[PDB]
Amino acid sequence: GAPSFPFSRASGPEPPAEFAKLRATNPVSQVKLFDGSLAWLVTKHKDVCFVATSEKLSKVRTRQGFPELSASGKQAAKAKPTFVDMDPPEHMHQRSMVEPTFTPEAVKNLQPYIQRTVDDLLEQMKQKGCANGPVDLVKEFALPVPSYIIYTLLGVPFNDLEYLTQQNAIRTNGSSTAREASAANQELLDYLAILVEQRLVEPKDDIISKLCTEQVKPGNIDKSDAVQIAFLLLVAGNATMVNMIALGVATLAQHPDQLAQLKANPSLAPQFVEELCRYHTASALAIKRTAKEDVMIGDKLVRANEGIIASNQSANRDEEVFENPDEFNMNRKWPPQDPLGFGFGDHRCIAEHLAKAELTTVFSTLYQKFPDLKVAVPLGKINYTPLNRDVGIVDLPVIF
Ligand code: HEM
C-alpha cells in the first residue's frame, strides 16, 4: 500500500529519506494522505517544473481530488479564495493588484529601509546583550526582521510592530493552545479591518492604501477582500522567512570554513543565500494541483480529478541537476536550471525578490555586527521543527 505523506525528515536539518530513493527508482508515485485518499508525488526537478507550469492542472481547492494534507486544510478550502488558490485569468487579475511593491526595481528601492530595519534590530540585540546567559536569536532577530518589514509594507504604523509581531508568532507557535492561536488570528484580522477602514478615509504610501484607492473604492474588490489579501501577504511567507534566517545561522555553525569565508567577505551573502534556499527548502508543500483532464507524467497516467504534490525540496536535491546535492556549498558552480526554493511558473513566490533581499541583508550584516556570534547549545541539540513538518528552527540560543 501507498505510504503516508507528508514524510518525516530524516533528522532535524535533513530532508525526508524517501525522496532520494523515489528519485532513483520511482520518481512519480502514489502516496496516502491523512484522510486515506491518494495523491501523486513528483520528485525530480524536471517533473516538478512540469507540474508547476502545466495548464492542465488546477490550484482550485473546491475541485474533486484536491490534495489537502490535514483537516485544517480541508476546512480552509471552504473560504472564498485569494490569488494563491486561483487559476488564470483570476490569478493574475488579483495578484497584479499587489505585485508592484515586490518587483525587482521596487525591492531595490527598498534596500535602505531593509538595511535600517536589520541594523536597528541588531542594535537592540546588542543593547539587550547576553551578559546573563544566551538569548534566543529567533525572538530577538529572526522573527522581527521579516515581521517588521511586511507589516510596514502593508501599512502598520511603527509603534504597533512589536505587539503585532508577538501576536502573529502566537498564532503559529507550537506551544499555543488552540484558543490562544485562534484569538491571535482573529486579533490580526480585526486589526487589519480597522486599518483598511482608516486607509479608505485617508490613504498613505502602503499596500493596503493602494488596494483601497485602486481596487476597493472603484468596486473591483470589497473591503473584506482587501483584508484577506493583506492577511495572505502577512501569513504566506513570514514563518518561512523566520525559519530561513535561523536555518542560515545554524548551517553556518555546521560549516565553519564557509562561515569564516563570509565573516571575511560580506559580499558572499548573495551566494550564501542562493545555496541556503536550495539546500533548506523550508516551504516544500505548496506546489499542489488536481488534474483537470488526464495527463501523463513520466511513466504514470494522472487521471482527471486526481491530486498531485510536486516536491520542490526533492527537486532541489536532484543529483541530475545539482552536483553533490546533499553538500552545502555556497561556492558551487550553478547549473542552467533554477533552484526551486520559491516555486516555479505563474505562482512562483510573489516575494522572491524581497525575501532574497532580506536574507542577503541579514547575512551580509549579522557577522559584521557580531563577529563572535555562536550557537550556544550543541548543534545536535538545536530545537528544530517536528520532523513531520517543513524544516525550520523553533528557537536558537546564541551568545555574541
Ligand atoms: C525565504 C522566504 C520564502 C520562501 C522560501 C517562500 C517560498 C514560497 C513558495 C515555495 C511558494 C509557492 C510558489 C509556487 O506555487 O510555485 C510561495 C508562494 C507565495 N509566497 Fe513565498 N516564500 C518566502 C517568503 C515570502 C514572503 C516574505 C511573502 C510575503 C511578503 C510571501 C508570499 C507568498 C505568496 C503570496 C505566495 C503565493 C503566490 C501565488 O500563488 O501567486 N512569501 N512562496
Curated annotation (Swiss-Prot):
Activity modulation comment: Cyanide, CO, and oxygen strongly inhibit catalytic activity.
Q: What is the effect of changing residue 74 to A?
A: Decreases the NADPH-dependent activity
EC code: 1.7.1.14
- Reaction(s) catalysed by this chain's protein: nitrous oxide + NADP(+) + H2O = 2 nitric oxide + NADPH + H(+); nitrous oxide + NAD(+) + H2O = 2 nitric oxide + NADH + H(+)
Q: Which PROSITE patterns match?
A: CYTOCHROME_P450
Pfam families the record matches: p450
Query: What role is this protein assigned?
Result: Nitric oxide reductase which is involved in a dissimilatory reduction of nitrite. Acts as a nitric oxide reductase. Is able to reduce nitrate and nitrite to a gaseous form of N(2)O when oxygen supply is limited or discontinued. May function as a detoxification mechanism.
What name does this protein carry?
NADP nitrous oxide-forming nitric oxide reductase
Native organism is Fusarium oxysporum (Fusarium vascular wilt)
Gene name, per UniProt, is CYP55A1
